[PDB]
Every structure is written in structure tokens, then in C-alpha cells.
Amino acid sequence: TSHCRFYENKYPEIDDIVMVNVQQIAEMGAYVKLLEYDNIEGMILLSELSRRSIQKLIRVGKNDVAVVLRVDKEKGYIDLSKRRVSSEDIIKCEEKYQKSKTVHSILRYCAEKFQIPLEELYKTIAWPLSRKFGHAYEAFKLSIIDETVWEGIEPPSKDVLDELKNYISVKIRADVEVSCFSYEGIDAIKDALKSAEDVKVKLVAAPLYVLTTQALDKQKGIEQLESAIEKITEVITKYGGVCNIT
């Protein structure tokens, strides 16, 4: 089950920005669910929505940025307006929304795993991350870089945390052909291996050797493979045998 607030409180404040996903239109305006503050419905009348084809632009599925004007803190009554929002801060609002979405995504694996309510989890997460630091995504990022924010609250489930970490967290193929005719060859092969392996090198049949080279930043794989090839070439020339590279 998906519920609970995004920031700190269930009810929005004055002048704050909220993103809405519209389900149905044309009766009063749009009384639809929120994505920035809880899942309680927020309403716009057919005047504040228009800034400058009026029916076609919104309809079903599309997202709208709106500023909160009137709040009734009793059970759940929120009023929204689209006309007042300026173009300069729209990008910022969007960014905020994205951050919120990311936070929500982060608090789903926990819900899935230990079969416990999501709201409680959210509450337990928001205290050292979303209150002290500012936003939660940045805190999470900081933690991933250097662990300092997870220290504040005691974990009821470390396994979940580990899983989350894992979630948050390149093989290049090469072929070397061996076709020696020398006196000793096995030893030479072994020597070659001792210079080519140390990542993962496997034997298949007899003339073919399959090796997978791991790269850190994708481009780094060319520098090691070539070196390995060179080493291999050096290896078999002295004894009196041949090894080919395709």
C-alpha cells in the first residue's frame, strides 16, 4: 500500500509548490491527487488554471505545476493556482519534484522486504535525513560517498539497508590462439597466464584461451589487453614456438 507525506507534514502551507497528476476534468476544474504533499485531493477552479485550446492541454495523465493559496487544516482541503507561478522558479520546482520522487522510490524496497508499514519507515528515515540536512536525496548521496547520516538513527533492519546500498551501487572479451611446436610449452603457457590473469581467464578446449578484462572507465581496457598480448609474444619467441593473436 502506497500512502504517507513526502516532506514533513500531511497538509501543505502557504505559497509552497505542488505537482498534480490529473485523472478527470470538466465539472468544477480539477480536484485530483498530489505528488508533492501526500495523496489527499487538491482542487483548482476553472479560472486560476488558465494562464494564456483550454480543454486539450491537460485532460488525463499529464502533470501540472501549481502554487497553494488556501489551506483548511481539519481533515483535507487544499486549494491550488497555476496562473501565479513564474517561469524562473518552474525549473527549481521540477527539480524538487524529481528529488521527492527519488526519495519515494528509495522508500519502497524496505516496504517490500520486511512486510512492515511504509509510513513508519518514512518517519524513521525523515528524522535524521530530511529534517537536519535539508533534502533527503542529497543526504543519501553523502552517505553513499562517506557514511555519516545513517549513524544518527539505529537500524531495525540492517539487511534492508545493505540491499538499498547494493541497489545504489565492464567486461571486454579477448581471444589468444596457442599453436606451439617447441620442446617445453606447458611451462611457457603457465608463465603467460601468470602475467595475463592478474581479471577472469578461462580454459575451453586446447588451442583457444578466453579472457575477460574488466574496465573502470570503459576506455581503460585497451591499455592492459595490448600489454598482455605483448607479454604473450615475448613468451614464445625464445623457446622455438608460435602463438597467434587474431
Partner: protein, 408 residues
């Protein structure tokens, strides 16, 4: 029970789809090598039989099992001999392998099926080859008898008898045996002991080894830091080998491809000997042994080492490109389905000359009457005199003509 290796080499001949592998299985138990990396090198496989006698009736004497419980007597079997089988295919295309097998063989087993036609050319050719390559100990075996009538089999036997009279093999025993039903093998075993003796062999003779098969010991899944050396499946006719000696493969190898070749024969030290099932220190001549040497596993892969001579360090044989042969020709051709007359040898023609185990293509330069000079494309070695079988081309594939000896 002592773990003694092979004493005498016995070979088996027949035809395609007749049944030889099955017969071998019936005789021994361990499945044949044939039937990419392992086993695949030639046409001959690898099998081993057991000769244990229980003497404490009629035909029932020898057995296949180590423990005697089948005939009646509960006493343990007496050690007689242990033999290695060389199964050669009887196909019209592949015959070089068969020829190679023949050179090492000391005993022969002929197989003819009952239901098929009585005169077969391939079988006759095989017989001729056997006659040529110093073999007289031949046992005739009838394969498919269960699908045949009461008198038909007798008639077939009579026909066979009529056929075999003018040949070198005079007193050849005839046994009817089932391959799929597994019966009458005891009689065969008895015959093996009776008719065929072991020729005198001593330590004094210089070591000579012939390699037929090649093996590489590499297993998928395991890491490369656990490797095994190259194994050369080689049979010995003369010369006793022990663990800790230097071996050389004679004919030569190409290592560089500009620049003239000067590199010596392939030197290798013996690591481990594979005889029958388990490793042994001594190697008694008269059997096929998987000689595991310091040679590359990549070299012992497929069609590279088929019929090549191997010598021990401290002995010098000769390598020839031009060979001097003393030949004798037959009247009519054997192997053709129809019989064609053998023509006189024409100068400058591609003919296949099989000296012992080597499969080489040779061209004729000079013909006199009995002596002939041949030019070889692929290198060959000569030690003493060697037993040679000659093969020519007339229609599509190779046909046997006669026998030859090196005059040196």
C-alpha cells in the same frame, strides 16, 4: 591380483555397419574411444581384454570376470595374460589407419556377417594385407548367425572353406559368435590361448616406438593453474622403456614460416605412462601405451601425429626423401566391387606408399623389373627394412596393388 600390462597386440577386421565395436564390447567391457579433443586423432580406438583361466570342460574354460561364480567352481581364476585390442574400421575411404594398425599387430580376427553376400572385396583385401604384413595367426569369426537358417550357415561356412586354401593362412580356426546376445566367447578365449603363442622378445634390442593416437588432457570448468602435459598414444614392438628417459619424434616439425628449416626432431622427457587403466613404472613391448611427455597439449590435438616413429636418446636412425623399393605385383585388383587387371607401373604418377605406419604420397622416377625409385613429398624415416603396402589410383579412391621392401 597383479596389475600387469599388455603382452601381445590383437587386431580386429571387418566391414562398415557389420559390427566390430559391439564385438569388442562383448569381449571386454570398457567402451571404445571412437563410436573433438580427446580420442579424436585416427580411426583406431583403445580397448583391453582379460585372459584368466579356471583349470581344476569341453569349450568352457576362460572367463571375462575376475571372480569365478558362473560355471560352477568357486575357486579364484589363474593369471595367464592381459591383452590390448586395436579395432580398425573396414571402410572404402579410410584404410591408412588400418594399415598403421596392421604394422604393430601380432594376431588377427576376421569378422563376416551371415545374412549378407558371401564374397566381399574389402574383406579379401584385408586378408591380403594381413598375409603381407608378417601375420599368420588368423581366427575367422561369424557375426550374425541368429538371424540365419540351419543349413544356410553351414553352406556359408563351406563356401568360406572353399575360398581359403591357396592363401598363406593354412590352419585357421572358425568360430560362430553372437555380438548382441553375448554368447560363445569362451571358445574364442580358449582359441586365443591355444593357437596364438607369444614371440621371443628381449631387453637387448634398441628401443623403437610407433605413435598412432594423440591426447590432450584438458578439462572445462577448472582453472588454468592446474594443467596436465601432452600425451602421445604410442605402441611398442621392440625396446623396454622405464620412467625417466628422453624421447624424440623423428620426422621433423615446422616452427617458422622466408628462412630455411634446420630445427632438430621434437625432444620430450617422459612424465607419466598410461597403461590399461593405472600408471606403471615399466613398459613391456607389445601394447599401446599413452606416453605422457613434456610435449605441448596443442600439438597433440587432432590430425598432426598419425603414424610417426619415436626413438630414445643415444640412437641414430636415418631420414629419407628418396627411397629405394623392391616391389612385387599381384595379378588382379582386390577391393573393387567386378575385378580389374593390374597394369604395369608408369613413370611420373601420384601413388600412395604405406611404409609401416606412415601415410605418404610418392612419385615414380625409374622402373626396371623389380627395383623402383620413389620421390616423397612428406618426410619419412627408415630404421631396418620395414613392411610396405602399396596403393594406386585408377577409379575415384585408393586401391591396393602389392607389397614392397626397402633395400638398404
Amino acid at each position: 591380483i597383479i596389475n600387469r600390462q599388455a603382452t601381445i597386440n590383437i587386431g580386429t577386421i571387418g566391414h562398415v555397419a557389420h559390427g566390430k565395436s559391439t564385438v569388442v564390447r562383448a569381449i571386454s567391457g570398457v567402451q571404445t574411444v571412437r563410436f573433438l579433443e580427446r580420442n579424436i586423432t585416427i580411426k583406431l580406438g583403445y580397448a583391453n581384454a582379460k585372459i584368466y583361466k579356471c583349470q581344476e570342460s569341453f569349450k568352457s574354460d576362460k572367463e571375462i570376470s575376475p571372480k569365478c561364480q558362473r560355471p560352477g567352481c568357486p575357486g579364484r581364476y589363474k593369471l595367464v595374460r592381459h591383452v590390448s585390442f586395436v579395432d580398425c574400421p573396414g571402410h572404402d575411404i579410410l584404410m591408412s589407419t588400418m594399415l598403421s594398425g596392421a604394422a604393430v599387430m601380432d594376431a588377427a580376427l576376421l569378422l563376416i556377417a551371415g545374412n549378407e553376400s558371401c564374397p566381399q572385396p574389402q574383406t579379401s583385401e584385408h586378408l591380403a594385407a594381413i598375409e603381407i604384413m608378417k601375420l599368420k595367426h588368423v581366427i575367422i569369426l561369424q557375426n550374425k548367425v541368429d538371424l540365419m537358417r540351419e543349413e544356410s550357415a553351414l553352406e556359408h561356412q563351406k563356401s568360406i572353406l572353399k575360398f581359403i586354401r591357396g592363401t598363406i593362412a593354412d590352419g585357421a580356426p572358425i568360430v560362430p559368435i553372437s555380438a548382441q546376445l553375448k554368447y560363445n566367447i569362451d571358445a574364442v578365449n580358449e582359441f586365443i590361448v591355444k593357437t596364438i603363442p607369444v614371440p621371443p622378445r628381449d631387453f637387448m634390442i634398441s628401443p623403437r616406438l610407433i605413435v598412432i593416437r594423440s591426447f590432450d588432457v584438458n578439462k572445462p570448468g577448472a582453472e588454468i593453474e592446474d594443467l596436465k602435459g601432452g600425451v602421445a598414444g604410442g605402441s611398442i614392438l621392440n625396446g623396454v622403456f622405464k620412467l625417466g628417459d628422453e624421447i624424440e619424434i623423428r620426422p621433423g616439425i615446422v616452427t617458422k614460416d622466408k628462412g630455411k628449416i634446420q630445427c632438430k626432431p621434437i625432444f620430450s622427457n617422459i612424465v607419466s605412462l598410461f597403461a590399461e587403466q593405472n600408471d606403471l613404472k615399466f613398459a613391456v613391448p607389445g601394447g599401446l601405451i599413452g606416453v605422457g611427455t613434456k610435449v605441448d597439449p596443442t600439438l597433440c590435438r587432432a590430425d598432426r601425429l598419425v603414424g610417426q616413429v619415436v626413438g630414445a636418446k643415444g640412437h641414430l636412425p636415418n631420414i629419407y626423401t628418396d627411397i629405394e623399393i623392391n616391389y612385387f605385383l599381384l595379378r588382379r585388383l582386390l577391393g573393387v566391387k567386378k575385378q580389374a587387371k593390374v597394369r604395369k607401373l608408369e613413370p611420373n604418377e601420384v601413388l600412395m606408399v604405406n611404409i609401416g605406419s606412415t601415410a605418404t604420397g610418392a612419385r615414380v622416377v625409374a622402373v626396371k623389373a623389380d627395383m623402383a625409385r620413389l620421390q616423397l613429398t612428406s618426410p619419412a624415416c627408415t630404421e631396418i627394412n620395414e613392411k610396405i603396402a602399396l596403393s594406386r589410383r585408377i577409379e575415384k579412391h585408393w586401391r591396393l596393388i602389392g607389397w614392397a621392401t626397402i633395400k638398404k
